From Swiss-Prot, chain A:
Consequence of substituting R105A: Significantly decreases Complement C3 beta chain binding
Summary of subunit composition and partner proteins: In plasma, properdin exists as dimers, trimers or tetramers in the relative proportions of 26:54:20. Interacts with the pro-C3-convertase enzyme complex (C3b-Bb) comprised of Complement C3 beta chain (C3b) and the Complement factor B Bb fragment (Bb), where it binds (via its TSP type-1 5 domain) with C3b and Bb. This interaction stabilizes the complex and allows it to become the active C3-convertase enzyme complex (C3b-Bb-FP). Interacts with C3b. Interacts with CFB.
Region of interest called Interaction with Complement C3 beta chain, as start-end residue ranges on this chain: 97-105
Glycan-carrying positions: W6, W9, T18, W67, W70, W128, W131, W134, N174
Species annotation: Homo sapiens
Domain TSP type-1: 3-59, 61-123, 125-207
Cell location: Secreted
Result of altering L21A: Inhibits oligomerization
Outcome reported for the amino acid change (mutating R76A): Slightly decreases Complement C3 beta chain binding
Function noted in UniProt: A positive regulator of the alternate pathway (AP) of complement. It binds to and stabilizes the C3- and C5-convertase enzyme complexes. Inhibits CFI-CFH mediated degradation of Complement C3 beta chain (C3b).
Annotated disorder: Properdin deficiency: Results in higher susceptibility to bacterial infections; especially to meningococcal infections. Three phenotypes have been reported: complete deficiency (type I), incomplete deficiency (type II), and dysfunction of properdin (type III).
Entry protein name: Properdin
Length: 207, 163
């Protein structure tokens, strides 16, 4: 039964981080007067976990943005290549956003290029699709939400060669259609482009 | 403004794990972007990262157990010093409403009908049993439901006749 008291508000541990905030500790361990044989104990508060403050911000690694919109599909010195069998090229852009304070840079290629045919504003033959899956209730949490499924006039893409050769090497590349065409089809229920149907949503809950 | 500062943001749960200390300002705790903060300790565990949209929650239960209903799910713009995609301040929720259908069976329980008349006693001498029977068909039960109680009742009858 040796009476134990408190030692120092003890020697400081160094701030364990070179950036931002960290947690040092000293506490006050029951070391200069140790309770022995299981008698009394050290009375008070032994807790010190201290917030050390380093005035240097930490590096943050930059994250990728979403992929942009596809550029118009043209070819150099070939007028307009719309509705023809002339393969062109198109581009898309991203943005490395958020890298500050000597952080790591974005890992990857920032540009995406593919070969394309230009189908922008070209008249095509079409066929009516079936009823799509029922959409969400719009507007949610507002006055009278309604569902929406639709049959749209899907264009029939022309049977062009799906690959193209390269001049420098014999290996071939993909071709992918791009554009907003004007599909031609017979009418269904008084519409030429898209016929939809709205049904209101039942038992709308509070948000 | 002093705010409780945590050491690790557990993603996909929204919970602030590993407590560092309290009373530090928001500009000092978020110098390390792997941290998280919590004001007033009543909720809203926000990470120190740039404001990005969190994951969509699971769907709420269907507002009715029968026929077509509606269910919600929310998403909270988590982050600090920035705006989410669409000029959205941090802390704003976004909901999505979809129609659900739990089952196609409705009012499974059924009520009792009118009681039938009393049958005569089961024996003409000594004692026996006497029974009334009713039906469970006003309205009829659907699916594997059943009428509450018993389908028949029984009591004794005395004929006052020596065998
Ligand atoms: C140009 O675009 C086309 C797409 O329009 C792209 O085609 C890709 O083909 C590969 C290989 O066929 C596909 O990978 C498949 O993945 C599925 C699972 O998702 C597997 O089941 C497939 O295995 C079978 O098919 C092989 C041959 O097709 C067999 O060898 C194999 O034993 C199995 O039978 C296969 O692994 C891929 O899904 C598509 N689509 C893409 C990548 O979007 C083509 O590669 C593109 N060309 C260039 C140069 O980029
Ligand atoms: C001290 O100097 C800073 C400039 C950084 O380079 C520090 O590195 C940091 O170490 C911790 C591990 O404890 C990582 O979590 C950080 O990502 C990293 O920035 C360095 O200690
Ligand atoms: C959920 O389970 C179902 C089987 C019903 O018991 C629901 O009760 C109520 O049934 C009426 C139909 O008469 C519906 O209008 C409602 O779905 C509900 O109020 C129960 O909620
Ligand atoms: C009704 O009237 C009585 C006077 C008897 O004649 C009955 O017949 C008796 O029925 C019981 C059981 O049903 C038997 O144990 C007797 O053997 C028989 O006499 C009658 O049904
Ligand atoms: C662009 O590419 C695909 C979507 O087409 C995804 O990996 C991602 O959204 C990226 O931004
Ligand atoms: C380019 O590619 C298609 C359009 O053909 C879409 O997924 C999108 O508009 C993208 O920017
Ligand atoms: C859609 O329109 C009519 C049906 O009304 C048909 O000519 C054809 O099925 C088209 O795809
Ligand atoms: C919610 O929406 C879908 C999940 O269906 C994903 O794009 C993503 O997880 C988002 O948080
Ligand atoms: C909501 O929809 C169903 C549950 O009804 C599941 O696919 C999933 O849990 C989603 O969050
Ligand atoms: C049987 O019991 C009495 C007749 O003894 C009446 O309350 C009623 O006719 C029932 O069916």
């Amino acid at each position: 039964g040796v009476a134990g008291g408190w030692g120092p508000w003890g020697p400081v541990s160094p701030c364990p981080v070179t950036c931002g905030l960290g947690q040092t500790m000293e506490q006050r361990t029951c070391n200069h007067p140790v309770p022995q044989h299981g008698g009394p104990f050290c009375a008070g508060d032994a807790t010190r976990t201290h917030i050390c403050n380093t005035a240097v911000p930490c590096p943050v690694d930059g994250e990728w943005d979403s992929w942009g919109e596809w550029s118009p599909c043209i070819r150099r010195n070939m007028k307009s290549i719309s509705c023809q069998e002339i393969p062109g090229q198109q581009s898309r852009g991203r943005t490395c956003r958020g890298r500050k304070f000597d952080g790591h840079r974005c890992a990857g290629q920032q540009q995406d290029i593919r070969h394309c045919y230009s189908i922008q504003h070209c008249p095509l033959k079409g066929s009516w699709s079936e009823w799509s899956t029922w959409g969400l209730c719009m507007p949610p949490c507002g006055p009278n939400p309604t569902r929406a499924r639709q049959r749209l006039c899907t264009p029939l893409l022309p049977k062009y060669p799906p690959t193209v050769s390269m001049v420098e090497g014999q290996g071939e590349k993909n071709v992918t259609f791009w554009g907003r065409p004007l599909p031609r089809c017979e009418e269904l229920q008084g519409q030429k482009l898209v016929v939809e149907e709205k049904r209101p949503c039942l038992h709308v809950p509070a948000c | 403004d002093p705010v409780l500062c945590f050491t690790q943001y557990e993603e996909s749960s929204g919970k602030c794990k590993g407590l560092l200390g309290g009373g530090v300002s928001v500009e000092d705790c978020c110098l390390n972007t792997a941290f998280a903060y919590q004001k007033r300790s009543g909720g809203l565990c926000q990470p120190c990262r740039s404001p990005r949209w969190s994951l969509w929650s699971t769907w709420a239960p269907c507002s009715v157990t029968c026929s077509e209903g509606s269910q919600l799910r929310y998403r909270r713009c988590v982050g600090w010093n920035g705006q989410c995609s669409g000029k959205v301040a941090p802390g704003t929720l976004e909901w999505q409403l979809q129609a659900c259908e739990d089952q196609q069976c409705c009012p499974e329980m059924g009520g009792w009908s009118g009681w039938g008349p009393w049958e005569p006693c089961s024996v003409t001498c000594s004692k026996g049993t006497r029974t009334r029977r009713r039906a469970c068909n006003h309205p009829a039960p659907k699916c594997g439901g059943h009428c509450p109680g018993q389908a028949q009742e029984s009591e004794a009858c005395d004929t006052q006749q020596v065998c």
